[PDB]
Design a protein around this ligand. Structure first.
Ligand SMILES: N[C@H](Cc1ccccc1)C(=O)N1CCC[C@H]1C(=O)NCCNc1ccncc1
Lengths: 26, 11, 249
């Protein structure tokens, strides 16, 4: 139910260094 | 190469 | 992972290391899908042509890791297995069709900054995201070249059209597989490799910003060869089996 939301990124509204490449491909 | 883990686990 | 980068701390908190007790060696990757269940490739546990057939007591799962070889005190958790479940129709004889296995942990792991489950896709997440051109992300501690990293590696790769996947190999491809990788002309590289097996191919939903595991690192011919692609177990196609195992046991 909390699946797929990372404590150190999504939960803090921080992005990792390449996740934009993923989202720019969709 | 691999660092030894606590033997508690290898039991 | 070939042509990947060092992961950030906490970047893949579902990443699991399958770890052999003796000799103490990394077996495979895997993923945490609840506090008690780990998803991996069946060939990590069972592959008769190579005389591979591991059982529960052969194995430890290590969760929360970043460094490949260090025992990461106060950060990782090491769990024992209660039960391994291999797909009843996993095809090790021919093409690794239905390359999937569940492992029930002997006790539930506690989540933390470094340990957190990934989602499994529903039908409409799969339909929406599993498209040629869309990129997913593969992680692992496997080989850097067809040598081993100090730290979890990460690479992002596009899904490849099904006919391109078929025309790249002599192996019979099924609907329970997809392939990912850059074409030779695309001028970007990267691939899973030996030791990455069983690890997660994940995508981030643009609708709810959650990470979903779409694939399991299954097989390839070489690592990062031009005109060759990585093949992954299609997790959604086999989710009915997953659901079945989990709420039966
Ligand atoms: N090289 C074989 C290619 C029934 C491929 C299906 C059947 C026979 C060869 C392979 O990858 N195999 C042989 C059986 C296990 C698997 C493996 O080593 N997988 C490791 C993952 N390797 C990758 C390399 C590059 N890209 C993705 C995965």
């Amino acid at each position: 139910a909390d699946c797929g939301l990372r404590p150190l990124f999504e939960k803090k509204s921080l992005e990792d260094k390449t996740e934009r490449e993923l989202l720019e491909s969709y | 190469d691999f660092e030894e883990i606590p033997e508690e686990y290898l039991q | 992972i070939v042509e990947g980068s060092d992961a950030e701390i906490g970047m893949s908190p579902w990443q699991v290391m399958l770890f052999r007790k003796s000799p103490q060696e990394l077996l495979c990757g895997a993923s945490l899908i609840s506090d008690r269940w780990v998803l991996t490739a069946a060939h990590c546990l069972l592959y008769p042509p190579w005389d591979k057939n591991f059982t529960e007591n052969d194995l430890l799962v290590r969760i929360g890791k970043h460094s490949r070889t260090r025992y990461e005190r106060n950060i990782e958790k090491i769990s024992m297995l209660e039960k391994i479940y291999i797909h009843p129709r996993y095809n090790w004889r021919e093409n690794l069709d239905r390359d999937i296995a569940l492992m029930k942990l002997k006790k539930p792991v506690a989540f933390s900054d470094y340990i957190h489950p990934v989602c499994l896709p529903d039908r409409e997440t799969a339909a929406s995201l599993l498209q040629a051109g869309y990129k997913g992300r593969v992680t692992g501690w496997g080989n850097l070249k067809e040598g081993q990293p100090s730290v979890l590696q990460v690479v992002n790769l596009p899904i490849v059209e099904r006919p391109v996947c078929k025309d790249s190999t002599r192996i019979r491809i099924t609907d329970n597989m997809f392939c990912a990788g850059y074409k030779p002309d695309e001028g970007k590289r990267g691939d899973a490799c030996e030791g990455d097996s069983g690890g997660p191919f994940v995508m981030k939903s643009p609708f709810n910003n959650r990470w979903y595991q779409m694939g399991i690192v299954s097989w390839g011919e070489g690592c990062d060869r031009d005109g060759k692609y990585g093949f992954y177990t299609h997790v959604f196609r086999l989710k009915k089996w997953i659901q079945k195992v989990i709420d039966q046991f």
